[PDB]
């Protein structure tokens, strides 16, 4: 399908290569790694409790739809006893082979 | 999208030396080797052949890019009409050259084929119009050039691979 | 009050999970 | 550079479902499908009474898929103790740009009748079946013609014998025949 | 299941009462009712059974060269079972979480 | 039969997603709850 439908469009050599791909271990070679990488971020969560007790705490809110490899996590400061201080709500997305 | 090429306005020394100086300026801007391509041309009394990026060839006297197959599909047609439509005169000049990428773009300069030929350059874009901004890049490259003259008032829209017809204009410069 | 609210939320979530598992205990139709 | 083979045939009208049932479980994995085509046969001649193979019969299904024509003509000699065979080619084209260039080059049409049918993926080969439909200009054979199409480079052409094995499968009301 | 039902009916009618009724009138040496029915079922029933058997034999005959007449042959019914396994493991994990919650409260 | 078992997993898959949905809600319902603890 893709091979024949290539003709109608002057696809770059990148797309020509992307017509096919690798498989097997390589996929898992990333996937599991990605998994444990999230685990590292997990530490950050409890590290919050370690980094700040009387100091400003940290709220956690993870995604409700996570793709095969990639995903994202919303994290805001959430200063105690106040809600009008929401001036730092940073968003990160995780990466399998590379860092977040 | 597919911006049209331009004639080599810069002519003050050897064409090879001129292309070398242009590539040196491009490298001074900062790019990387993205491979080398070519642009073929074969006229038949007037179907003008062409090839660019790249697993597909093109040939059209006057049409809106009827090419969607490899050269084999077309070369077989030419070989079949060896006396019907085979009007292959003196082989039309064909250019070639490397291609670099400053940033999120692509640049390509041409070369002479028989020796008294041009060494024009070609650039494209990534939008779908917008001919004003893309000119600024060339302003950093050379002086006043690139009239463009695309198939305006069509967006038959966005000129997909139709710039090869504009390439025929470069072949007109002989 | 905070501990009471936390316990109430925990009990609500527990009841929700209980209901959820109980309704689809036999999700499989037949074999 | 390439050639094609054919062992086409035909079968009765009532005797299709029992036939295609067997044809499905011959060399296809699963999920039988079909296709509605559109005939755009052209004509390019006027100097030697020998036109080209401009039967650009292409599907009228969901867009995106490009219409095109294939080369099929001038049956060359050879095929010692074998079935039909012809050195041929294929050529894809842009959407409706092919007809545009054909009309700009001064060509005419050849047919206006469409024959939808079914397909079935063989191994190194392929099989198809279709039936002509009687329609007017703005809209016939009453017989589903079938065929065993396979295209490949020169090679050894030994697989034609394997094609003959498929002839063994098409025993009940199917056979092979040439055209003259 | 038309062919299966036809084969079942043919099997049930193979050992019909015709083979057992050929020894009924010969025992009736004291009175001669509709006894003539014991004559028409001598060979006509067997002839019809043989005709039906030959007809059933002359079916499509799918098996010609290799392994035709497939039909299961295929996909992720296996992965459907794996999905049922996912459901079971999710059940187990939910039960474990409920037990952990109960232990915590 | 395949089609049949297709449904057998299809709705099931949806159910799992539904579970996720519920779980997600529960997830969120606890996240704010995690904020309250001033340890």
Swiss-Prot record, chain A:
Segment of the intact protein contained: 401 to 500 of 649
Species of provenance: Mus musculus (Mouse)
Quaternary state and interactors: Component of the Mediator complex, which is composed of MED1, MED4, MED6, MED7, MED8, MED9, MED10, MED11, MED12, MED13, MED13L, MED14, MED15, MED16, MED17, MED18, MED19, MED20, MED21, MED22, MED23, MED24, MED25, MED26, MED27, MED29, MED30, MED31, CCNC, CDK8 and CDC2L6/CDK11. The MED12, MED13, CCNC and CDK8 subunits form a distinct module termed the CDK8 module. Mediator containing the CDK8 module is less active than Mediator lacking this module in supporting transcriptional activation.
Function comment: Component of the Mediator complex, a coactivator involved in the regulated transcription of nearly all RNA polymerase II-dependent genes. Mediator functions as a bridge to convey information from gene-specific regulatory proteins to the basal RNA polymerase II transcription machinery. Mediator is recruited to promoters by direct interactions with regulatory proteins and serves as a scaffold for the assembly of a functional preinitiation complex with RNA polymerase II and the general transcription factors.
Phylogenetic classification of the source organism: Eukaryota, Metazoa, Chordata, Craniata, Vertebrata
Family: Belongs to the Mediator complex subunit 17 family.
Name of the protein in question: Mediator of RNA polymerase II transcription subunit 17
Protein's cellular compartments: Nucleus
From Swiss-Prot, chain B:
GO BP: positive regulation of transcription elongation by RNA polymerase II; positive regulation of transcription initiation by RNA polymerase II; RNA polymerase II preinitiation complex assembly; skeletal muscle cell differentiation
GO CC annotations on file: core mediator complex; mediator complex; nucleoplasm; nucleus
Key words, A-Z: Activator, Nucleus, Transcription, Transcription regulation
Places the protein is found: Nucleus
Role played: Component of the Mediator complex, a coactivator involved in the regulated transcription of nearly all RNA polymerase II-dependent genes. Mediator functions as a bridge to convey information from gene-specific regulatory proteins to the basal RNA polymerase II transcription machinery. Mediator is recruited to promoters by direct interactions with regulatory proteins and serves as a scaffold for the assembly of a functional preinitiation complex with RNA polymerase II and the general transcription factors.
Family from the record: Belongs to the Mediator complex subunit 20 family.
Name of the protein described by the UniProt record: Mediator of RNA polymerase II transcription subunit 20
GO terms, molecular function: transcription coregulator activity
First and last residue of the signal peptide: none
Swiss-Prot record, chain D:
GO CC, alphabetical: core mediator complex; mediator complex; nucleoplasm; nucleus
GO MF terms, alphabetically ordered: transcription coregulator activity
Residue positions, PTM Phosphoserine: 50
GO biological process terms held by the UniProt record: positive regulation of transcription elongation by RNA polymerase II; positive regulation of transcription initiation by RNA polymerase II; RNA polymerase II preinitiation complex assembly
Transcription regulation found in the keyword field: yes
Keywords in alphabetical order: Activator, Nucleus, Phosphoprotein, Transcription, Transcription regulation
PANTHER family: MEDIATOR OF RNA POLYMERASE II TRANSCRIPTION SUBUNIT 18, MEDIATOR OF RNA POLYMERASE II TRANSCRIPTION, SUBUNIT 18
Identification of the protein by name: Mediator of RNA polymerase II transcription subunit 18
Organism: Mus musculus
Gene that this polypeptide is encoded by: Med18
Curated annotation (Swiss-Prot), chain E:
Gene3D superfamilies to which the protein is assigned, alphabetical: 1.10.287.3490
Coiled coil (UniProt feature): none
Localization per Swiss-Prot or TrEMBL: Nucleus
GO terms of biological process kind: positive regulation of transcription elongation by RNA polymerase II; positive regulation of transcription initiation by RNA polymerase II; protein ubiquitination; RNA polymerase II preinitiation complex assembly
Residues that span the membrane, as ranges: none
Alphabetized GO MF terms: transcription coregulator activity; ubiquitin protein ligase activity
Cellular component, GO annotation: core mediator complex; mediator complex; nucleoplasm; nucleus; ubiquitin ligase complex
Known tissue expression: Expressed in cochlea.
Keyword Acetylation among UniProt keywords: yes
Subunit structure: Component of the Mediator complex, which is composed of MED1, MED4, MED6, MED7, MED8, MED9, MED10, MED11, MED12, MED13, MED13L, MED14, MED15, MED16, MED17, MED18, MED19, MED20, MED21, MED22, MED23, MED24, MED25, MED26, MED27, MED29, MED30, MED31, CCNC, CDK8 and CDC2L6/CDK11. The MED12, MED13, CCNC and CDK8 subunits form a distinct module termed the CDK8 module. Mediator containing the CDK8 module is less active than Mediator lacking this module in supporting transcriptional activation.
PANTHER family tied to this protein: MEDIATOR OF RNA POLYMERASE II TRANSCRIPTION SUBUNIT 11
Protein family membership: Belongs to the Mediator complex subunit 11 family.
Protein's UniProt name: Mediator of RNA polymerase II transcription subunit 11
Organism: Mus musculus (Mouse)
Gene name for this UniProt entry: Med11
């Amino acid at each position: 399908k893709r091979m024949r439908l290539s003709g109608p469009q002057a696809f770059d050599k990148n797309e020509i290569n992307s017509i096919q791909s690798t498989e097997g271990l390589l996929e898992k070679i990333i996937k599991q790694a990605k998994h444990i990488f999230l685990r590292s971020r997990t530490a950050a969560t409890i590290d919050s409790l370690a980094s700040r007790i009387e100091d400003p705490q940290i709220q956690a809110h993870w995604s409700n739809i996570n793709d095969v490899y990639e995903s994202s996590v919303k994290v805001l400061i959430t200063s105690q006893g106040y809600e009008q201080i929401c001036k730092s709500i940073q968003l990160q997305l995780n990466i399998g082979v590379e860092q977040v | 999208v597919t911006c049209v090429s331009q004639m080599p306005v810069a002519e003050g020394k050897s064409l090879q030396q001129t292309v070398e100086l242009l590539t040196k300026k491009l490298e001074m801007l900062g790019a990387e080797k993205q491979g080398t391509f070519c642009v073929d041309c074969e006229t038949y009394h007037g179907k003008l052949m062409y090839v660019m990026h790249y697993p597909l060839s093109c040939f059209a006297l006057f049409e809106n890019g009827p090419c969607l197959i490899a050269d084999t599909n077309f070369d077989v047609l030419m070989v079949k009409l060896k006396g019907f439509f085979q009007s292959a005169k003196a082989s039309k000049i064909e250019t070639r050259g490397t291609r670099y990428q400053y940033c999120d773009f692509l640049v390509k300069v041409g070369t002479v084929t028989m020796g008294p030929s041009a060494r024009g350059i070609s650039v494209e874009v990534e939008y779908g119009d917008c001919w004003s901004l893309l000119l600024e890049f060339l302003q950093s490259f050379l002086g006043s050039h690139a009239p463009g003259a695309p198939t305006v008032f069509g967006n038959a829209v966005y000129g997909p691979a139709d710039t090869m017809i504009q390439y025929m204009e470069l072949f007109n410069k002989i | 009050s905070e501990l009471q609210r936390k316990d109430a939320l925990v009990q609500k979530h527990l009841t929700k999970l209980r209901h959820w598992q109980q309704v689809l205990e036999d999700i499989n139709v037949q074999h | 550079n390439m050639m094609e083979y054919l062992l086409q045939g035909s079968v009765l009208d009532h005797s299709l479902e029992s036939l295609i049932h067997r044809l499905r479980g011959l060399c296809d994995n699963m999920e039988p499908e079909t296709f509605l085509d559109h005939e755009m046969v052209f004509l390019l001649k006027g100097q030697q009474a020998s036109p080209f193979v401009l039967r650009a019969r292409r599907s009228m299904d969901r867009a995106g898929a490009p219409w095109h024509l294939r080369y099929l003509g001038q049956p060359e000699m050879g095929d010692k103790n074998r079935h039909a065979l012809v050195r041929n080619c294929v050529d894809i084209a842009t959407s409706e740009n092919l007809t545009d260039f054909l009309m700009e080059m001064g060509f005419r049409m050849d047919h206006e009748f469409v024959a939808k049918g079914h397909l079935f993926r063989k191994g190194i080969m392929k099989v198809v079946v279709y039936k002509i439909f009687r329609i007017l200009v703005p809209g016939l054979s009453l017989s589903y013609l079938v065929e065993l199409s396979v295209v490949a480079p020169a090679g050894q052409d030994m697989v034609s014998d394997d094609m003959r094995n498929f002839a063994e499968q098409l025993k009940p009301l199917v056979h092979l025949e040439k055209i003259d | 299941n038309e062919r299966l039902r036809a084969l079942e009916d043919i099997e049930r009618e193979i050992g019909a009462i015709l083979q057992n009724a050929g020894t009924a009138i010969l025992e009736l040496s004291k009175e001669k009712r509709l006894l003539d029915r014991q004559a028409a079922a001598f060979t006509t029933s067997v002839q019809h059974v043989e005709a039906e058997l030959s007809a059933q034999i002359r079916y499509l005959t799918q098996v010609a060269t290799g392994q035709p007449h497939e039909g299961s042959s295929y996909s992720s019914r296996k992965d459907c079972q794996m999905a049922l396994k996912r459901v079971d493991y999710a059940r187990l994990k939910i039960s474990d979480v409920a037990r952990t919650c109960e232990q915590m409260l | 039969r395949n089609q049949q078992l297709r449904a057998l997993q299809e709705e099931c898959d949806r159910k799992l997603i539904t579970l996720r949905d519920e779980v997600s809600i529960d997830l969120y319902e606890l996240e704010e709850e995690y904020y309250s603890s001033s340890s």
